[PDB]
């Protein structure tokens, strides 16, 4: 009954067209892993803390994030949305129905890091390099689709890009985290703010095609609750 999330917040192999999004593997190594909890928010909005990262790790394929979604108010909302949604409520090929996982895959399939401008990564950065991770309609970096699940081992196991050794390391950390010690996330946003973002999401050019390609880029193994 824990709700975990995993996924890449950067995949090294992708061509990065915008210089501000580039994360040099040879530079971020000095700032990873991050094991202290960072907030997990929605669409970089204020008042939308929904949980906490359990670890941000450098792996061969990119930078991999694990987190727990813990906000009671958020989980209650998601559950209610799942009950009304058609997409959240549909059959999933080969897996038992999980409305909450399904609605999160419809609503917030993407992960997006907030991190210090990479001009500063070359130097001695002025503050923490990694600020928070946001759940979103679609990431700006490719390959950044989430996998949501109730079993952390199953979540990480979905990424064939993540080695048996890398997984063991990651889960060793995730296992050592007591979810009950984490503070209660600050989830107080008006639903109208979130709904405006959901509406905007529908106009994102080639969104569904990019979600499908992101699944490949991340090397996610079927079956999963992903909707594209």
């Amino acid at each position: 009954q824990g709700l975990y999330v995993g996924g890449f917040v950067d995949v090294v192999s992708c061509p990065k067209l915008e210089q501000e999004l580039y994360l040099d593997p040879d530079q971020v190594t000095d700032y990873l892993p991050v094991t202290e909890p960072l907030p997990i928010t929605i669409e970089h909005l204020p008042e939308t803390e929904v949980g906490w990262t359990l670890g941000l790790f450098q792996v061969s394929h990119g930078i991999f994030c694990t987190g727990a979604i813990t906000s009671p108010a958020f989980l209650e909302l998601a559950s209610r949305l799942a009950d009304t949604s058609h997409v959240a409520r549909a059959p999933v090929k080969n897996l038992p129905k999980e409305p909450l996982l399904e609605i999160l895959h419809t609503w917030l399939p993407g992960l997006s890091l907030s991190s210090i401008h990479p001009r500063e990564l070359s130097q001695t950065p002025s503050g923490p390099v990694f600020q928070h991770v946001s759940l979103c309609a679609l990431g700006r970096r490719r390959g950044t689709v989430a996998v949501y699940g109730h079993d952390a081992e199953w979540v990480v196991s979905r990424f064939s890009s993540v080695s048996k050794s890398e997984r063991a390391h990651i889960l060793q950390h995730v296992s050592s985290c007591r979810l009950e010690d984490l503070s209660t996330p600050n989830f107080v946003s008006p639903l109208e703010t979130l709904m405006a973002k959901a509406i905007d999401a529908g106009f994102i050019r080639d969104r569904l095609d990019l979600l499908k390609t992101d699944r490949g880029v991340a090397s996610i193994l079927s079956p999963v609750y992903l909707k594209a």
Binding site: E20, L21, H44, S112, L113, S114, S115, I116, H117, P118, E120, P125, S126, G127, Q131, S134, C136, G139, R140, R141
Partner: peptide
């Protein structure tokens, strides 16, 4: 410092 959001 400036952060890039994502």
């Amino acid at each position: 410092p400036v952060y890039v959001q994502x």
